[PDB]
């Protein structure tokens, strides 16, 4: 009795922007699935950002490093916006080394095989002095939602390493979602609906797999309603 949809054209502009079409939808199902998908997309999508950073000389985020015009927690704030996608690893640790009077970009990080840098132009910090040395360990892991650094020191159990700068982790790769429901004509079928989801990413997750995992979550939650 009930017609079921599929994903047709997935038109991609920037690496950060995309427009996904969903074409065989019934009346009312454009908006029923559109919102309930926007609600899933924005909130519960796996992705990875940086969790912990060790800086060579620094003892804590409120220090100064001779030869850098950024404060340490300004450098930690730069890393929070580091867009990495890692493959078969759940947590990887990167190594950043650069000296000279150059801005230290995200391309200046040592590249692991499983690691992909989305914004090589991304600015981590600047270097002012000539021979001004900087080297750091940046620990990225995959995660969901928004995990603050405050909630990380409950388990702890000896995270004593006095130079391990814990950073807040905003792991969602979704930045923004909008869905517009317009009528769809597919030869004969008086009125149907074409659902267009438009979404911005940090580059780590691709649009198609995001929607697939978005609706996968949705089917699993309804499993507690398929029966009682």
């Amino acid at each position: 009795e009930f017609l079921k949809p599929r994903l047709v054209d997935i038109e991609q502009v920037s690496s950060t922007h995309a427009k996904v079409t969903l074409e065989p939808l019934e009346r009312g199902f454009g908006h029923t699935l559109g919102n309930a998908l926007r609600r899933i997309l924005l909130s519960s999508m796996p992705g990875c950002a940086v969790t912990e950073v060790e800086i060579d000389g620094v003892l804590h985020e409120y220090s100064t490093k001779e030869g850098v015009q950024e404060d340490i927690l300004e450098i930690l704030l730069n890393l929070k916006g580091l867009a990495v996608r890692v493959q078969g690893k759940d947590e990887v640790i990167l190594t950043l080394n650069k000296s000279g009077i150059g801005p230290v970009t995200a391309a200046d990080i040592t590249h692991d095989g499983d690691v992909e840098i989305v914004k090589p132009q991304h600015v981590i910090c600047h270097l002012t002095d000539e021979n001004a040395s900087i080297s750091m360990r940046i620990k990225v892991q995959r995660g969901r939602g928004y995990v603050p650094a405050s909630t990380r020191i409950h388990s702890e159990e000896d995270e004593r390493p006095i130079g391990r700068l814990l950073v807040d982790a905003c792991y969602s790769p979704v930045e923004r979602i909008a869905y517009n429901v317009e009528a769809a004509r597919v030869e004969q079928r008086t009125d149907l609906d074409k659902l267009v989801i438009e979404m911005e990413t940090n580059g780590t997750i691709d649009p198609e797999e995001a929607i697939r995992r978005a609706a996968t979550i949705l089917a699993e939650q309804l499993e507690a309603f398929v029966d009682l």
Binding site: R38, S43, Y62, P148, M199
Partner: protein
């Protein structure tokens, strides 16, 4: 009577939470009441929340 003093200086970083007083410049006080998910936020036709 005092023989020596040790002063420890603590850098407390305080985010924002229900109870904090906030106001604009026009005499408009207000205490934040619920911290809400980006999804529940009223968004415009563009997808940009508030």
């Amino acid at each position: 009577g005092v023989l020596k003093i040790v002063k420890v200086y603590l850098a407390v970083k305080r985010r924002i939470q229900p109870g904090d007083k906030m106001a604009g410049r026009h005499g408009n006080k207000g205490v934040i009441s619920k911290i809400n998910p980006i999804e529940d936020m009223p968004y415009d036709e563009n997808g940009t929340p508030v």
